[PDB]
Amino acid sequence: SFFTKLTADELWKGALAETGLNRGQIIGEGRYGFLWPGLNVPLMKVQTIAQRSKEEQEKVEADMIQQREEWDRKKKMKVKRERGWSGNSWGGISLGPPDPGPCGETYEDFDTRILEVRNVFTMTAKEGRKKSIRVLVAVGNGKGAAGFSIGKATDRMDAFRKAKNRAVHHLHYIERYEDHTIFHDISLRFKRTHIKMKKQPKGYGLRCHRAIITICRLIGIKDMYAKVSGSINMLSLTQGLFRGLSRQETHQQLADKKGLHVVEIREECGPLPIVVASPRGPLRKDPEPEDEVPDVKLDWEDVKTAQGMKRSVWSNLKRAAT
Amino acid sequence: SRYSPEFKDPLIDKEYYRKEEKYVRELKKTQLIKAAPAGKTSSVFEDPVISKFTNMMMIGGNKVLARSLMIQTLEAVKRKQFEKYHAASAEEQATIERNPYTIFHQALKNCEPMIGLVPILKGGRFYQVPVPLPDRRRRFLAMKWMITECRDKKHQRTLMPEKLSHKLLEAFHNQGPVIKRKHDLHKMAEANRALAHYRWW
Amino acid sequence: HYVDWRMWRDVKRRKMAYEYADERLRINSLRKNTILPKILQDVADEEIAALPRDSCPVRIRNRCVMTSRPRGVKRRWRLSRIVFRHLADHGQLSGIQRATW
Amino acid sequence: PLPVRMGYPVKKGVPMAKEGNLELLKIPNFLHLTPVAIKKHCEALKDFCTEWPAALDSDEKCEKHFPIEIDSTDYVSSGPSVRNPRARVVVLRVKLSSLNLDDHAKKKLIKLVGERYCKTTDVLTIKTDRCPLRRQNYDYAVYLLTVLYHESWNTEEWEKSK
Amino acid sequence: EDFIKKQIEEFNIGKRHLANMMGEDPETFTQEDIDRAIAYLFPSGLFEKRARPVMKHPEQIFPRQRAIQWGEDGRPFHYLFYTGKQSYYSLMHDVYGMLLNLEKHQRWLIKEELEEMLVEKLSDLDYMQFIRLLEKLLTSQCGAAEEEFVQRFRRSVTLESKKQLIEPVQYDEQGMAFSKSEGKRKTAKAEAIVYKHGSGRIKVNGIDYQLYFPITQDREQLMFPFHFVDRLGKHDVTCTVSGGGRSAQAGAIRLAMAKALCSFVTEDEVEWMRQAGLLTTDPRVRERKKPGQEGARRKFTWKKR
Amino acid sequence: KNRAARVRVSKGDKPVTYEEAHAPHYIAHRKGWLSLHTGNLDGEDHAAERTVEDVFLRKFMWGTFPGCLADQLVLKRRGNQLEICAVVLRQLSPHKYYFLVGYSETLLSYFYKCPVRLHLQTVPSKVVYKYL
RNA sequence: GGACCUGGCGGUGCUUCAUAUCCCUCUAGAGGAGCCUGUUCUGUAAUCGAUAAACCCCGAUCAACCUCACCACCUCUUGCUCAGCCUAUAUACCGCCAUCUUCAGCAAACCCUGAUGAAGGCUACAAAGUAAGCGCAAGUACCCACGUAAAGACGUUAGGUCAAGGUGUAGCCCAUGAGGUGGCAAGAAAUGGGCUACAUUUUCUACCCCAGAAACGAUAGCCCUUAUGAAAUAAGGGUCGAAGGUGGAUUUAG
Ligand SMILES: [Mg+2]
Ligand SMILES: [Mg+2]
Ligand SMILES: [Mg+2]
Ligand SMILES: [Mg+2]
Ligand SMILES: [Mg+2]
Ligand SMILES: [Mg+2]
Ligand SMILES: [Mg+2]
């Protein structure tokens, strides 16, 4: 019947079952070919109750069908999701720059790349298991400034957006040799992750953990080696890395501490002593006491490498640029 | 109830209004007050105990009948007393009280049990522990027991008011089923002397 | 274009009743007496029996107009206690308000 | 022109504004029939209105002059049809003392007419519910009354067996 | 603020229009009249009076806020801004200062009202503290200014319902003082006519009370108020009764009788009567039956099993 | 959990109108009746007939005016009249609306033998009461 | 495997409370009898659904035919419908409910503590929380501000319902569609909830509360009318005149 029918929204709801269509048709459109002065025909005036020919109506129908098909095609169109580490993982994939502040204060210089996405569950009283998303996000702009965050929420997008904002608010500065490197070799134990980073020359690339690479890129660090030992909790790794980058002396700082001149002597260049950082003020006339055979509790792996005793097949592998 | 907590209960006895007290009066004046319920009356003749008894008797909320029955019992008692006294036998003023109300009161007094048994579980078994009853409870027991005796059914075709009257008479000089029951209860209590330490109050 | 087959059947029955009602009434009148002969009465009864079923007024069942359901149907509105309720709640029946009481 | 705000206020807000409320629409409204307007209308309609004579208040004078009281109603429902049966009915309340032409017929009329005729106030009250139209019903009632009166006046032979 | 101002003007205009429309011609006319007009010509008829159609001066309608606590170039106006809930804090400080001054020298608000006064949202504990402070101040023994300040918060109540309203005395046909009064009880209305003087009996609907009431309890009830007074047999009464059953009717009559007596009995006696509870309409009436239950409160059986 | 007309709190996003945002228990209290006719008074006749008509009319209106009804209609009757108050969006051209309206009036009139004269209420957006 | 976090549970400790609720206490009931009507199990060629609290005079504000879906027999095929289906999925759903609820919480959006772990965020002489929004409350109805209605969010239970209506998906489409005639329900039993008693506070008659008699109970049928209706389920009258002679463990309501 007619009274047994009902509104569309309800029907749609019924169809969907997400609780455990009228674009194409124009207000004058008909199955039968007809032409009314108000709609379908020109606005009022031709002014007569005309009807379409069979052929014309058929043509119209065909056109409509074509339009529908086109729409369907449009709907069913894959957009190219950039491949972050692994296709089907929220790895190095980029979110856009973090949304602007309350007063204004835009962050168009900054870029946001994800580091992990975990579906964290919690058993609550009446609700049962609550599927929350937890996301580790980093922020950086090049130029040495960067930070990170652990936004968590019931939705993914929400989590991302919180996280980006958090990152924007919590930034470290990371001093760099030139644009391209760490000032020196770092050895930091964070909780149970050990990270051994080595300073390298230009054209070495970033040969470190994928996350570590991404973070470096974000920072502005362009080329260096890093070994990640112990556990590999992502959060621990990230935080530890950040700490390491914060706590490395500049050459200027060193100079200040010691007097003296921080003079680098390259093998690439000649014997020529290049002075990097001299002290802003006085100069200590007593030279450093070169107490020979210096006690530095040094790593075994490095020693092995130097010697050639260890030869793992997964070490010097040809990889894609960074 | 449809009276608010603002509303307080009405003190009815009119000898109270025939003279801290002043303060109380003032307070009352300041406050609102409940209406006087039906049975509790201004009259000189009203006896509260008797009213209570009548209420107890009442079944199916048909009060008038109950009242009538109560009246009849009293009448019967009076008649009995007169028989004992006036024409038949000697005019023994001392041994025969004629006031039925007084007799009733005496009976009630007699019927009061100064100990009662509470059931208390311990280990996994039920013990009948003796307890000192408050006066109100005792009073209730008195009347209720009497009423149940009257009801019995072993007395059969006999009407109520007569039977009740008889019971009252029996009570008056320490006889009858109610008194026996009371005595039995007492005996039981005595038997469970030792279980007074099971009680925690 | 009625709600279901039952509804249609009911409608048909109603129509039949409307068609043959007067005659039925007459026959009942003829029957229901102590006045006048027995043979005549018998004949009348026979005639009534012969007359087709569904023209019978008692086979007319009440349903809701909207949903074809036989029970919970208020005869004031001719709709079911579900449909009626639905109507009421949105506020599409004048007068009908919830009994706060 | 009025800035009327019609609706229940939101927890920390205002009653809903004038320019898009269903509630206002729902209200049956008296924007027409402003007192002045009403007065004007009345003035306009002082024609159509022949004032009634000095037959006086208290209903005594009227009774003396006009006996009989017919009084039929008529209901004004909504919707496309106007056919309401209840409207057709008519009663005819007439005072028996005001009839003033009966001696023995007073004794007979009452006998004839059972549940009608109140004794506290001598009022015959025939009610006509038979025919469909109102006017015809009224006519019937009138006729009924007249015939009844005639019957009362014209005594029969069998009467004597009292 | 601009918007509000605009609305004010618009409101005024609307009012003027309304005035023009209605028979009351002047542009100056009261709020009550306006309300009446609105009722007449937008008759909602809804039970919620807030949901009814209204138009007023929008300074009554809108809930105002403390707009702009800092000017241009930051710098908040009031010195206790960074506390938050600043006004309350300021008030507290002032109170403290006053107390100190006093020391050197030698009913209450409700939370909602306080909030309204201030503008800021205020918790219960804070309110309590404030009250305590006020109390302390009061205790102190103060000058006039302090008293005035205190009064700003403290608001009166009006105490009602203590006396019984004494009816007239009236004389009809002959010189006889006769008091009319009326009582209801349990769907049973009464109307008693007590005559002062005229010693004897009570007529209920013409019939004498002895015949109208066969039962002793009802008789007692009828007697009651007179007995209480002490003026037992000194008044004749005619009493129209209607509705309900026996006992209820009797109760109603008693109530009415009491009321009548109030008319010409000493005020102290009236007070006593009131205290004793025979001048108050008992609002105990048969409870509505519910559609889940067998009776008004008794429910159908195995709810637990 | 009774859940008849009352629209459900999912988030703070759902824009809801005043009639739509009020539960059935408010009908006399904070709301009004949409339809208005004598039938449901007592004693009085022809309620059932009216109800069906009312049901039809709203549906018809919805069909005619697609995405051009902001809120539910108000049906009124005065003897032999059938007035309608539709709150419409300012979406389509006025000419089209005009064309529609007359047609509706004629068609409805011919159906029910009752002079209809509906009056529209142009409002640019749905008048939000709550963001539920 | 270790150590946490959140929950759930503990015949888990302390403290404080349930004012018809947990006990003692009250009052009237059920369980014993006959019926009335539901369920189960049985019977039948013959529905379906609900089926611990939260089913069991429940969907039904009603099954003689109808209703109706069920079963037997006999027909119909563009068929009331631009078909139809009370066919399968309530574990696809909307809609409309139950439930804890006789309760006060649930929340977006921020911020902080956890070396930035799952998480947590209480101290007014205040130690880090702030909050729109929904709920309680407040307003409303009814005989008031009391009471009772109504209201009661998020979730719980894949709780109830495809047979109220609508519909996703999957099927039947000379049949799981449609129409006709007849029929189908009766208890060896078990159990739930009613009614009525078992008598003297009673039974009958008057009167509707001062009376006079008596020393019950009222089905089951049996016949006979009456009402209804095409057709007998109800109502009355005669007749008969069961069991029962205050109910066990237990449990229901106020
Ligand atoms: Mg892949
Ligand atoms: Mg509920
Ligand atoms: Mg079928
Ligand atoms: Mg409720
Ligand atoms: Mg509330
Ligand atoms: Mg299930
Ligand atoms: Mg199921």
Q: Specify whether the CB–CB gap between A191 and A229 falls below 8 A.
A: no
CB contact under 8 A, D21 and F18: yes
What span, in angstroms and rounded, lies between the C-alpha atoms of E281 and E164? 12
Percentage helix, strand, coil for chain A under 3-state DSSP, each rounded to 5: 25, 25, 50
Closest C1' nucleotide to C59's CA: G66
- Kindly tell me whether chain F and chain D come into contact, counting contact as 3+ Cβ pairs under 8 Å: yes
Q: State the DSSP code for D33.
A: S
The DSSP H or E segment spanning E148 is helix E144-153
What was the structure determination method? cryo-EM
Two structure tokens written together for E165: 């309203």
Percentage helix, strand, coil for chain B under 3-state DSSP, each rounded to 5: 50, 10, 40
Residue A56 neighbours by CB under 8 Å, 6+ apart: A33
Supply the angle between the helices E124-140 and E86-105 in degrees, to the nearest 10.
20
What span, in angstroms and rounded, lies between the C-alpha atoms of E212 and E204? 7
Cβ burial, residue E229 (10 Å; 0-12/13-18/19+)? buried
The upper half-sphere exposure of residue B138, i.e. CA atoms within 13 Å in the direction of its Cβ, equals: 15
In the three-class reduction of DSSP (H, G, I as helix; E, B as strand; rest coil), residue F36 is classed as strand
The upper half-sphere exposure of residue D89, i.e. CA atoms within 13 Å in the direction of its Cβ, equals: 8
Closest C1' nucleotide to A12's CA: G94
Of F131, F69, F81, the closest CA to residue F109 belongs to: F81
Residue type, E152: R
What span, in angstroms and rounded, lies between the C-alpha atoms of F81 and F79? 6
Residue A153 neighbours by CB under 8 Å, 6+ apart: A132, A133, A159, A162
Q: Is the dihedral of CA A141, A147, A150, A152 positive or negative?
A: negative
Q: For the CA atoms of chain B, what is the radius of gyration?
A: 22
> Is F6 (CB) below 7 Å from strand G?
yes
Closest C1' nucleotide to C72's CA: G61
Q: Specify whether the CB–CB gap between F80 and F115 falls below 8 A.
A: yes
Two structure tokens written together for A250: 């500049």
> Is B129 (CB) below 7 Å from strand G?
no
Q: State the DSSP code for A302.
A: H
Cβ burial, residue E265 (10 Å; 0-12/13-18/19+)? buried
Q: Which of residues 63-102 of A touch C (CB under 8 A)?
A: none
What span, in angstroms and rounded, lies between the C-alpha atoms of E23 and E27? 12
CB contact under 8 A, E274 and B41: no
- Report the DSSP beta bridge partners of residue B129: B118
Instruction: Please state the domain count of chain C.
Output: 1
What span, in angstroms and rounded, lies between the C-alpha atoms of B167 and B108? 11
The DSSP H or E segment spanning E165 is none
CB contact under 8 A, F113 and D80: yes
Pairing of strands A193-199, A186-190: antiparallel
What span, in angstroms and rounded, lies between the C-alpha atoms of F101 and F87? 13
The count of other CB atoms within 10 Å of the CB of residue F74 is: 24
The count of other CB atoms within 10 Å of the CB of residue F107 is: 13
> Which residue spans within A176-260 are E strands per DSSP?
186-190, 193-199, 206-207, 224-230
Q: For the CA atoms of chain E, what is the radius of gyration?
A: 31
Cβ burial, residue E124 (10 Å; 0-12/13-18/19+)? exposed
Phi, psi values for residue A157, rounded to 5°: -60, -45
Per-residue CA distances from B45 to B51, B82, E220, E254, F21 (Å): 11, 21, 10, 19, 66
Tell me, in Å, how far CA of C12 is from C1' of G77?
21
Residues lying close to strand G (Cβ under 7 A), chosen from 80-99 of chain B, are none
> Is A21 (CB) below 7 Å from strand G?
no
Q: Specify whether the CB–CB gap between A300 and A273 falls below 8 A.
A: no
What span, in angstroms and rounded, lies between the C-alpha atoms of D92 and D142? 8
Residue type, A193: T
Per-residue CA distances from D138 to D61, D90, D127, D150, E13 (Å): 24, 6, 9, 19, 58
What span, in angstroms and rounded, lies between the C-alpha atoms of A215 and A223? 12
Q: Specify whether the CB–CB gap between D162 and D108 falls below 8 A.
A: no
Tell me, in Å, how far CA of C90 is from C1' of G102?
30
CB contact under 8 A, F29 and E47: yes
| Boundaries of domain holding C17 | 1-91
Q: Specify whether the CB–CB gap between B173 and B109 falls below 8 A.
A: no
What span, in angstroms and rounded, lies between the C-alpha atoms of A95 and B184? 91
CB-based contacts of E124-128 (< 8 A; 24+ apart in sequence): E126/E85, E126/E88
Q: Which residues of chain A lie closer than 8 angstroms to F62, CB-CB?
A: 7
CB contact under 8 A, F39 and D20: no
Q: Give the DSSP per-residue string, C81-99.
A: TTHHHHHHHHT-SSS----
Determine contact: E48 vs chain F, CB below 8 A: yes
Smallest CA–CA distance, residue F92 to chain A, in Å, is 10
CB contact under 8 A, D36 and E62: no
Supply the angle between the helices E124-140 and E111-118 in degrees, to the nearest 10.
90
- Report the DSSP beta bridge partners of residue A227: A196
C65 is a domain residue: yes
Question: What is the widest separation between alpha-carbon atoms in chain D?
Answer: 92
Of E159, C6, A75, the closest CA to residue B31 belongs to: E159
Q: Specify whether the CB–CB gap between B162 and B78 falls below 8 A.
A: no
Residue F22 neighbours by CB under 8 Å, 6+ apart: F5, F6, F30, F31
Q: Give the DSSP per-residue string, A78-117.
A: -------SSSSS-SS-EEPSPPP-SS----SS-EEEEEEE
Two structure tokens written together for F49: 């007939």
> Is F11 (CB) below 7 Å from strand G?
yes
Q: Specify whether the CB–CB gap between A220 and A144 falls below 8 A.
A: yes
What span, in angstroms and rounded, lies between the C-alpha atoms of A280 and A50? 95
The count of other CB atoms within 10 Å of the CB of residue D79 is: 21
Per the document, the length of chain A is 322
C98 is a domain residue: no
What span, in angstroms and rounded, lies between the C-alpha atoms of D95 and D90? 17
Q: For the CA atoms of chain F, what is the radius of gyration?
A: 16
Two structure tokens written together for C64: 């809701």
The count of other CB atoms within 10 Å of the CB of residue A160 is: 21
Q: Specify whether the CB–CB gap between E167 and E177 falls below 8 A.
A: no
Sheet holding D123-128, edge to edge: D69-70, D90-95, D123-128
Two structure tokens written together for B107: 């009976």
N- to C-terminal Cα separation, chain D: 82
- Report CA(F20)–ligand 5 centroid distance (Å): 20
CB contact under 8 A, C3 and A4: yes
Q: Give the DSSP per-residue string, B71-112.
A: HHHHHHHHHHHHHHHSSSS---TTT----HHHHHHHHHHHH-
Q: Is the dihedral of CA C35, C38, C42, C43 positive or negative?
A: negative
Two structure tokens written together for B197: 């330490």
CA F42 vs. chain centroid, Å, equals 24
What span, in angstroms and rounded, lies between the C-alpha atoms of E170 and E164? 19
Chain G bases near protein CB atoms (7 A cut-off): 5-8, 22, 24-29, 52-54, 56, 59-69, 80-81, 84-86, 92-100, 102, 107-112, 114-119, 124-126, 131-134, 139-158, 164-168, 177-181, 192-194, 199-202, 209-210, 215, 228-231, 246, 251-254
Phi, psi values for residue A111, rounded to 5°: -130, 145
- Report CA(F26)–ligand 2 centroid distance (Å): 16
C100 is a domain residue: no
What span, in angstroms and rounded, lies between the C-alpha atoms of E106 and C87? 76
Q: Specify whether the CB–CB gap between A206 and A221 falls below 8 A.
A: yes
Q: Specify whether the CB–CB gap between A2 and F59 falls below 8 A.
A: yes
Q: Which residues of chain F lie closer than 8 angstroms to D23, CB-CB?
A: 18, 31-32
The DSSP H or E segment spanning A300 is helix A300-307
Residue A172 neighbours by CB under 8 Å, 6+ apart: A145, A146, A147, A242, A245, A246
What span, in angstroms and rounded, lies between the C-alpha atoms of F81 and F59? 19
Residue type, D63: E
Residue A135 neighbours by CB under 8 Å, 6+ apart: A90, A114, A116, A117, A118, A150, A151, A152, A156, A159, A160, A163
Of D128, D90, D121, D125, the closest CA to residue D109 belongs to: D125
Q: Which residues of chain B lie closer than 8 angstroms to E161, CB-CB?
A: 32
What residues in chain F have their Cβ under 8 A from chain D's Cβ atoms? 17-19, 30-34, 36-39, 44-46, 49-50, 70-72, 74, 76-80, 85, 87, 112-114, 121, 123, 127, 129-130
Q: Specify whether the CB–CB gap between D96 and D117 falls below 8 A.
A: yes
Cβ burial, residue C77 (10 Å; 0-12/13-18/19+)? buried
Phi, psi values for residue A94, rounded to 5°: -95, 125
Q: Give the DSSP per-residue string, E9-40.
A: HHHHHHHHHHHHHSS---S---HHHHHHHHHH
- Report the DSSP beta bridge partners of residue D92: D70, D126
Q: Specify whether the CB–CB gap between A84 and A146 falls below 8 A.
A: no
Residue nearest to nucleotide G132 (CA to C1'): F12
Two structure tokens written together for B41: 């009356």
Residues lying close to strand G (Cβ under 7 A), chosen from 20-79 of chain C, are 24, 28, 31-32, 45, 48-49, 53-54, 56-59, 61, 64, 66-74
In the three-class reduction of DSSP (H, G, I as helix; E, B as strand; rest coil), residue B129 is classed as strand
Q: Which residues of chain D lie closer than 8 angstroms to E44, CB-CB?
A: 6, 23, 27
CB contact under 8 A, F29 and E44: no
Q: Is the dihedral of CA A173, A178, A179, A182 positive or negative?
A: negative
Closest C1' nucleotide to C49's CA: G230
**Residue A163 Ramachandran class (φ > 0 left, ψ -120 to 50 alpha, else beta):** alpha
What span, in angstroms and rounded, lies between the C-alpha atoms of B37 and B55? 13
What span, in angstroms and rounded, lies between the C-alpha atoms of C67 and C84? 11
Q: For the CA atoms of chain C, what is the radius of gyration?
A: 20
The count of other CB atoms within 10 Å of the CB of residue A63 is: 10
> Is A4 (CB) below 7 Å from strand G?
yes
Q: State the DSSP code for B39.
A: S
CB contact under 8 A, B38 and E274: no
C28 is a domain residue: yes
Residue B7 neighbours by CB under 8 Å, 6+ apart: B32, B33, B34
Chains near E with 3+ CB pairs less than 8 A apart are: B, D, F
In the three-class reduction of DSSP (H, G, I as helix; E, B as strand; rest coil), residue A46 is classed as coil
The DSSP H or E segment spanning D62 is helix D60-65
What span, in angstroms and rounded, lies between the C-alpha atoms of B176 and B163? 12
What span, in angstroms and rounded, lies between the C-alpha atoms of D75 and F44? 10
Smallest CA–CA distance, residue F61 to chain D, in Å, is 16
In the three-class reduction of DSSP (H, G, I as helix; E, B as strand; rest coil), residue D139 is classed as helix
Which residue carries 């009407």 as its tokens?
B159
The count of other CB atoms within 10 Å of the CB of residue C43 is: 14
Smallest CA–CA distance, residue C78 to chain A, in Å, is 14
Q: Specify whether the CB–CB gap between C93 and F51 falls below 8 A.
A: yes
- Report the DSSP beta bridge partners of residue B118: B129
Determine contact: F11 vs chain A, CB below 8 A: no
Helices (H), chain C: 5-31, 38-50, 83-90
Per the document, the length of chain E is 305
What span, in angstroms and rounded, lies between the C-alpha atoms of B63 and B58? 5
In the three-class reduction of DSSP (H, G, I as helix; E, B as strand; rest coil), residue E241 is classed as strand
In the three-class reduction of DSSP (H, G, I as helix; E, B as strand; rest coil), residue B134 is classed as coil
- Report CA(E291)–ligand 5 centroid distance (Å): 21
**Nearest-5° angle of CA A234, CA A238, CA A240?**
115
Smallest CA–CA distance, residue E162 to chain B, in Å, is 6
Chains near C with 3+ CB pairs less than 8 A apart are: A, F
Two structure tokens written together for E103: 């020391």
What span, in angstroms and rounded, lies between the C-alpha atoms of F78 and F115? 10
**Nearest-5° angle of CA A8, CA A9, CA A12?**
85
CB contact under 8 A, E21 and D7: no
Report resolution (Å) to 1 decimal. Answer: 3.5
The count of other CB atoms within 10 Å of the CB of residue D148 is: 17
C61 is a domain residue: yes
CA E42 vs. chain centroid, Å, equals 29
Two structure tokens written together for C8: 């249609």
Q: Is the dihedral of CA C96, C97, C100, C101 positive or negative?
A: negative
**Nearest-5° angle of CA B6, CA B12, CA B14?**
135
What span, in angstroms and rounded, lies between the C-alpha atoms of A81 and A88? 10
What per-residue string of b and e applies to B159-183 under the rule 16 or more CB within 10 Å gives b? Answer: ebbbbbbbbbbbbbeeebbbbebbe
N- to C-terminal Cα separation, chain F: 18
Residue type, B93: Q
> Is F16 (CB) below 7 Å from strand G?
no
Q: Specify whether the CB–CB gap between C48 and C24 falls below 8 A.
A: yes
The upper half-sphere exposure of residue E143, i.e. CA atoms within 13 Å in the direction of its Cβ, equals: 9
- Calculate the dihedral angle through the C-alpha atoms of D17, D18, D19, D22, rounding to the nearest 10 degrees: 90
Q: Which residues of chain C lie closer than 8 angstroms to A2, CB-CB?
A: 1
C101 is a domain residue: no
- Report CA(F6)–ligand 2 centroid distance (Å): 14
CB contact under 8 A, E44 and D6: yes
Tell me, in Å, how far CA of F1 is from C1' of G163?
24
Smallest CA–CA distance, residue F31 to chain E, in Å, is 8
Which residue carries 């300021």 as its tokens?
E90
Q: Give the DSSP per-residue string, A133-156.
A: EEEEEEEE-STTEEEEEEEEESSH
Two structure tokens written together for C31: 């029957």
